[PDB]
């Protein structure tokens, strides 16, 4: 708990010491990289994780409209560019829609967000719709797990040859593509947080921001692991059938 | 589950809404083991703490449908619900109740007031609403207040059982559920007639029935937050240090 203001250097390795509490270090997470998952599990997460991803562009938007200052923008539409894709077949949503398919999905079970659990798409939307209220430089620096992004992505290039054979070869892509847009987005991110996060007021709230990200991300995997692991899924004492909403209501009707 | 082709009745829609009580929260399993007998004190804290979060968030809820609601009429009806959490006078209303059942099971009014306690999974559940009110129209809003119809029957579950399982919770923390009795059922008056008056087609029943859907929910991942975190010693961040190390603050509404 920070009284005296921290400096740019100081303040950056209180941000990254929050790296602790990344999601790497979740049961769930920990159990894919060494094996122990099963099909059913591999396949939920990465249907889950595509509602998160089919979010980041939305939520970069909705900083974009918070910012007045042109420059800003000028570097945080490539992110849209990155996940949207530029034409038709490139996206990194479609290198996940690729990455659905390599682990024997369609396109059509990702696509219709039909298994994207209530516990995911709450801990996801709350980050949307804290980058629609927040000012935007709140909102952009919650970006800022990215720093420990490029560590896991990493982890599941190593891993998931082995102790997973049947995972089609072109799904690793996305995980790939990201090991260098996840480090140029946090060279801003860092920029601006460094810049930004100028007193001891603002350095603490900005901790309180990133534990808010970490919540989200570890929430995501705690309503995986209650309906894939612990056979736990919503109203299982009532049916097994997938009973939950599954359509993004104030978006679409 | 089902789907409506041909435009319900009033009548006939109001049913279809109450047949989504089969997916109410009195059956996830946490309040199954509260209402057993089976769930410790740490439990039963943990979820009066939590809970106090949703208590909290009520009558921002219904002021962000106040807020989106252009006709006085409705207002001055909807308004009550913020009179009967606020209260009027001092240490009257629905929020200080629950204070009131925090200390019948053993903690402070601070325990509850500092929000320290409660995980971001209910966090998240909770805002959920919050945000849907906020943005939807008021109508839409209005009527995802109608899990509101299997209330009463979970408030008398737990005035059945709780005192016979758990006789160091003091009475007077009874209050709060023995109130809503009633107050749930002024409220699904109006919450009726507004359904019944503004799904007068199909999509609109399907979308409603789709938003109670998500209300249901809602409920039902709060209280998987708190299984994993109070039944499954399984909290936020169990594998690196068993201190709590969740955000604790509304960070859009505060600093
Ligand atoms: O796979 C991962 O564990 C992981 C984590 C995160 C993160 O830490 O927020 C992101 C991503 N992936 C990712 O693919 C991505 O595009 C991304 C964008 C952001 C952001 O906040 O703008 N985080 C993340
Ligand atoms: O203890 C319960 O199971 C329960 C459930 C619900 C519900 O169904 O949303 C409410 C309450 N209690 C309650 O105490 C309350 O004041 C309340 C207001 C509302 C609403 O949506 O506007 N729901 C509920």
Redesign the pocket.
């Given at each position: 708990l920070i009284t005296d203001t921290l400096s740019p250097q100081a303040f950056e390795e209180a941000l990254r010491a929050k790296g602790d509490f990344?999601?790497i270090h979740h049961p769930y997470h920990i159990a894919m990289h060494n094996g122990d998952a099963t099909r059913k599990q591999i396949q939920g997460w990465v249907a889950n994780?595509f509602y998160?991803?089919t979010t980041?562009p939305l939520?970069?938007a909705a900083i974009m409209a918070n910012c007045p200052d042109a420059q800003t923008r000028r570097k945080w539409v490539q992110?849209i560019l990155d996940?949207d894709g530029s034409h038709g077949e490139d996206g990194?949503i479609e290198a996940w829609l690729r990455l659905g398919e390599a682990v024997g999905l369609s396109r059509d079970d990702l696509l219709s967000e039909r298994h994207v659990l209530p516990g995911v798409r709450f801990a996801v939307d709350a980050?949307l719709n804290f980058a629609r209220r927040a000012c935007w430089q709140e909102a952009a620096c919650?970006?800022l797990?990215?720093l420990?992004?490029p560590q896991?992505?990493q982890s599941r290039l190593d891993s998931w040859p082995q102790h997973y054979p049947w995972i089609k070869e072109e799904g690793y892509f996305?995980?790939r593509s990201?090991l260098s847009?996840?480090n140029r987005?946090v060279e801003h991110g860092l920029a601006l947080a460094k810049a930004y996060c100028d007193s001891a007021e603002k350095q603490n709230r900005m901790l309180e921001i990133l534990q808010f990200?970490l919540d989200i991300?570890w929430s995501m995997l705690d309503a995986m692991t209650m309906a894939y692991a612990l056979q736990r899924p919503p109203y299982h004492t009532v049916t097994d059938k997938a009973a939950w909403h599954t359509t993004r209501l104030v978006l679409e009707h």
């Open positions: 990344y999601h994780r998160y991803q980041i939520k970069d992110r996940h990194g980050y919650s970006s797990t990215e420990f992004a896991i992505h996305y995980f990201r847009q996840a987005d990200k991300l």
